[PDB]
Design a binder for this molecule. Structure first.
Ligand SMILES: Nc1ncnc2c1ncn2[C@@H]1O[C@H](CO[P@@](=O)(S)OP(=O)(O)OP(=O)(O)O)[C@@H](O)[C@H]1O
Ligand SMILES: Nc1ncnc2c1ncn2[C@@H]1O[C@H](CO[P@@](=O)(S)OP(=O)(O)OP(=O)(O)O)[C@@H](O)[C@H]1O
Ligand SMILES: [Mg+2]
Ligand SMILES: [Mg+2]
Ligand SMILES: [Mg+2]
Ligand SMILES: [Mg+2]
Lengths: 196, 196
């Protein structure tokens, strides 16, 4: 399970305006909301055979194609299906939170998230020390997926040109070159239809 | 071990220019270098009784005061001692990498890192789902530690005013208010002497 180059698909989802929300809600509520959210979103990943790499604050990092082998087309099919399922689950989560006066009330709006997906080469395996290590992916490909997530609009799914090669033309909303932090050359991005 | 408010100290260390280095070095070398680095840096954390929260790419997140209770003064003493020990270990790591032509040669410079340390309230405990959860800290206090790391110069240690309350005046190099992403009010920062 040592680190080696591999073609994988990385998905990043990140809650919109979690900072403000993490101030207008008691620590008790913030913890419950975030965990209820993470529970449903990780379910979306697992049900689509993805791997939950880690959580980073209000974000979820998911991998497709590692550790288990997966074809390039299936990696994309599953990652997009995951993102679309996450949005569906979110709509249901907010209905419940609304009734519990956890969102929509006071100054905390319904939860929304941004999602970026990129497919490319990465060094994947166990990183860390003998005392503490974790399976993850390293390389510019991971940075790209993260910048796509940060660049896209709330409740939207932005993917790279690589990922878009496997997506029907009818499902591509917008094609646009963007300058992503850390990457020299402009990156072609495609916002895809959020509906399953 | 459920999430609850707690006064803790968060330390973030992040490799300078890892992107460029993660391109001028074969995936094999990048993986070895990063793991050798992580091995020595996590050792610094553990030997100073800190907790390794997680790794985020080229960064290490460490906590002091959770899960094990620790006084505010000891949290700071240990976090700073950790940062200072990390710099010392780095100097030794580069000597070895230099001899192995892993750094200093071609276009890959000796490894350097940025470090930010902040102490404050955070909701700490297990976050995630029944299927996958991890012990971590959540809240603006964590964002502050991360922004201090990003704001400081290579091979330097930047801490917040809270942390500086426990640091001798002779060890404070520079005091300066900085606008950190995500935080409304300006944050008072203090760059501390890197030598043990
Ligand atoms: N538990 C954690 N583990 C690791 N890094 C963390 C962290 N919590 C925070 N950080 C770091 O602090 C940064 C900001 O934390 P957010 O991600 S919770 O907040 P935002 O999404 O930027 O804010 P928004 O736009 O209002 O939703 C993270 O990116 C991490 O680098
Ligand atoms: N394994 C991983 N797990 C989680 N997030 C990751 C990741 N790898 C990358 N990211 C995300 O991608 C971002 C950039 O990756 P870097 O941290 S390796 O690179 P830099 O430090 O910004 O570059 P530098 O200035 O040249 O040293 C991370 O902050 C994460 O949000
Ligand atoms: Mg967010
Ligand atoms: Mg975030
Ligand atoms: Mg870095
Ligand atoms: Mg980094």
């Amino acid at each position: 399970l040592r680190p080696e180059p591999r073609l994988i698909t990385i998905l990043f989802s990140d809650i919109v305006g979690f900072t403000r929300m993490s101030n207008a809600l008691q620590s008790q509520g913030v913890a419950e909301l975030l965990n209820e959210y993470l529970g449903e979103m990780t379910r979306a990943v697992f049900e689509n055979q993805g791997t939950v790499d880690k959580f980073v604050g209000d974000a979820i990092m998911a991998l497709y194609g590692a550790p288990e082998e997966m074809s390039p087309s299936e990696q994309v099919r599953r990652a997009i299906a995951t993102a679309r399922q996450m949005l569906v689950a979110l709509e249901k989560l907010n209905q419940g939170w609304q009734e519990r006066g956890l969102v929509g009330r006071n100054e905390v709006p319904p939860v929304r998230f941004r999602c970026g997906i990129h497919q490319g080469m990465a060094v994947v395996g166990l990183f860390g020390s003998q005392e503490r290590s974790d399976f993850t992916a390293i390389g510019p490909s991971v940075n790209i997926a993260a910048r796509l997530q940060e660049a896209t609009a709330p409740n939207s799914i932005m993917v790279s040109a690589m990922v878009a090669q496997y997506v029907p033309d009818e499902e591509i909303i917008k094609r646009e070159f963007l300058e992503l932090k850390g990457i020299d050359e402009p990156v072609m991005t495609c916002v895809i239809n959020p509906n399953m």
